[PDB]
Design a protein around this ligand. Structure first.
Ligand SMILES: Nc1ncnc2c1ncn2[C@@H]1O[C@H](COP(=O)(O)OP(=O)(O)NP(=O)(O)O)[C@@H](O)[C@H]1O
Ligand SMILES: Nc1ncnc2c1ncn2[C@@H]1O[C@H](COP(=O)(O)OP(=O)(O)NP(=O)(O)O)[C@@H](O)[C@H]1O
Ligand SMILES: [Mg+2]
Ligand SMILES: [Mg+2]
Lengths: 239, 251
RNA sequence: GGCCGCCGCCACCGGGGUGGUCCCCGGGCCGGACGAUCCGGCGCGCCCCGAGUGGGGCGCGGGGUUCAAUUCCCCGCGGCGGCCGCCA
RNA sequence: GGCCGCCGCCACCGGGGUGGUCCCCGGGCCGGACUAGAUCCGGCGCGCCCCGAGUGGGGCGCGGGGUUCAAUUCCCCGCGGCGGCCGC
């Protein structure tokens, strides 16, 4: 069967590169897989503007959503907030597909390094900040626990990852009358105990009086709430 | 004014993507919200190509353009080899009553092969030659397919001029749904007088076997009569038609 | 490219009407008498008279019905919508 | 990361309800009835104590404290399990 693979990690950690390589190995193992991320649409605009984010976010989600109907989808996005990963998981749940969160990690050193090597189009200060605010996968919710944690400073074994993911895709993602009688007879008993201030010994009789009464009732086939309750009220009035 | 759909068309390696980015940049400096979209966005998200992904690719790409045109100028960076493809892109713009301009980019087979080689010949040169050979320039069969601009991408391109021309055109009223404006009509009484005076004129022409000359006077006699009547406020159909019959009788 | 539905082929543009040589409503422009207003008009082609660069005549894809076709009928070309085919 | 919360601590398991000494629902298992069946009847955990020392019977308790005539329920603390919204 097929699944939703959710990457998470800071800008420059290697999400996009890891995505392409993962997809390529999967393709060799005979799987139809597509790589999606908010960046596809975000970079389609010639400049950045806060006001495009809504459309960017909505459109990326529609593509992911429509793609998971027929293909494995690798979501290549920073996904720094747990609520963002929750949102992606809701798509998998909706289609009853399995999902795996893959957390790519790297020291802040490497991150700043790589960011400089890219023209620091994202200011290093913002990178530092994001590293601090990042939501550690699984620290808050079991559903957020990373299927794998990848160290992008060391070599990566895609065949092994593929193998594990393929196995995971084969798992099963699972994700009147009577009570009325009990409820109400309980109310009546409390009403009665109040109106007569019975003693410790006489209340116990009333309790037992109700147990015996209820037990007898669950024996008869035809039972009408209102009529049974009336029978109970008068049983107490003459006891 | 408002926003429009810019449709690019031209063979692989002609420079569509490069032209797209530059045009999008200039438009942006000119205060326009524009996005660049093409089937490649989705096609290259797959690690391999398979003909069965194409339906999805097409469905996905059109949905994006469609939803984006509600809010932004859309530049479509796709080969758009066939007119029916450009037609489908126009129907999106008609769906939202937005202007559109087909921009046709060309270059000699000479440059296309060279550039195709410099790209590792992912597309066999043979295919490039053939595509180039069978390609029908836009506008050769349909008027709605006539390019707004034809750009030689081997020559210098002036993006400010183009941007300028594009902005002007966005400020025009599309000839899409000006075909449903069923109004500016006269009240039933007026139209009833037009219709009836027309039949009376015909009845009269018959009863007196007029010649081409004498008929023209009757026609002008009707024109002058209706003109005068639409100047009065209170008009009774039956009364007016009698006045017209008599006007003809003492002619 | 094929099938079906519908519309255009009256001529500044849009819409509408119509067996009257077109007409109506809104928009545009030109001319004229008087500058608003009012009155006349508007494309293309062929011919003719004129001699000055104007006036007039015939025509508007083909054919039919008819005194008369923009209108009705058959065919041709084109538009729009629907459905199929095409789509390195 | 912030704010908040749900579930269990009634006792085969899971879900639900409930100030009445617990109950309802689904599943499971044990014993009996049953010319493999199904249905019907009875029942189910841990701890300490007692008669018997019989694969038997009875008693009391169910993390601690509080409100109570009565707590599975409600408040507070404890242990174990899990989530929501928002941070965009
Ligand atoms: N596994 C790796 N080891 C070392 N360098 C890497 C590795 N993966 C990627 N890089 C380099 O790190 C830089 C950024 O890689 P990239 O995959 O674009 O990160 P990203 O997380 O997708 N970035 P962003 O899209 O901005 O969040 C480039 O120089 C990559 O070549
Ligand atoms: N105006 C230009 N002058 C010189 N080279 C150009 C020009 N435009 C594009 N190129 C180059 O031609 C090659 C392809 O350009 P590109 O804009 O990607 O063409 P394309 O039509 O988008 N190709 P494709 O996506 O395969 O249909 C690259 O080397 C471009 O830099
Ligand atoms: Mg990336
Ligand atoms: Mg391109």
């Amino acid at each position: 069967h097929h699944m939703l693979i959710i990457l998470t990690g800071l800008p420059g950690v290697g999400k996009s590169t890891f995505s392409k390589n993962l997809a390529k190995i999967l393709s060799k193992n005979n799987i139809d897989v597509i790589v999606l991320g908010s960046d596809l649409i975000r970079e389609s605009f010639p400049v950045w503007k806060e006001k495009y984010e809504e459309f960017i976010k909505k459109s990326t989600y529609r593509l992911i959503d429509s793609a998971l109907k027929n293909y494995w989808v690798i979501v290549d996005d920073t996904n720094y907030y747990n609520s963002m990963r929750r949102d992606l998981i809701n798509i998998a749940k909706k289609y009853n597909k399995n999902y795996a969160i893959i957390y790519l990690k790297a020291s802040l050193d490497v991150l700043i390094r790589r960011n400089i090597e890219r023209g620091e189009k994202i200011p290093n200060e913002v990178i530092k900040k994001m590293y601090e605010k990042f939501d550690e996968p699984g620290k808050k919710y079991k559903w957020d626990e990373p299927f794998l944690i990848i160290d992008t400073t060391k070599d990566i074994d895609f065949n092994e990852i593929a193998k594990k993911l393929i196995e995971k895709s084969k798992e099963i993602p699972k994700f009147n009358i009577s009570d009325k009688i009990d409820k109400e007879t309980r109310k009546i008993v409390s009403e009665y105990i109040k109106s007569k201030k019975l003693d410790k010994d006489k209340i116990k009789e009333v309790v037992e009086l109700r147990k015996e009464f209820l037990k007898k009732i669950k024996k008869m086939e035809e039972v009408d709430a209102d009529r049974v309750l009336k029978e109970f009220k008068d049983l107490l009035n003459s006891y």
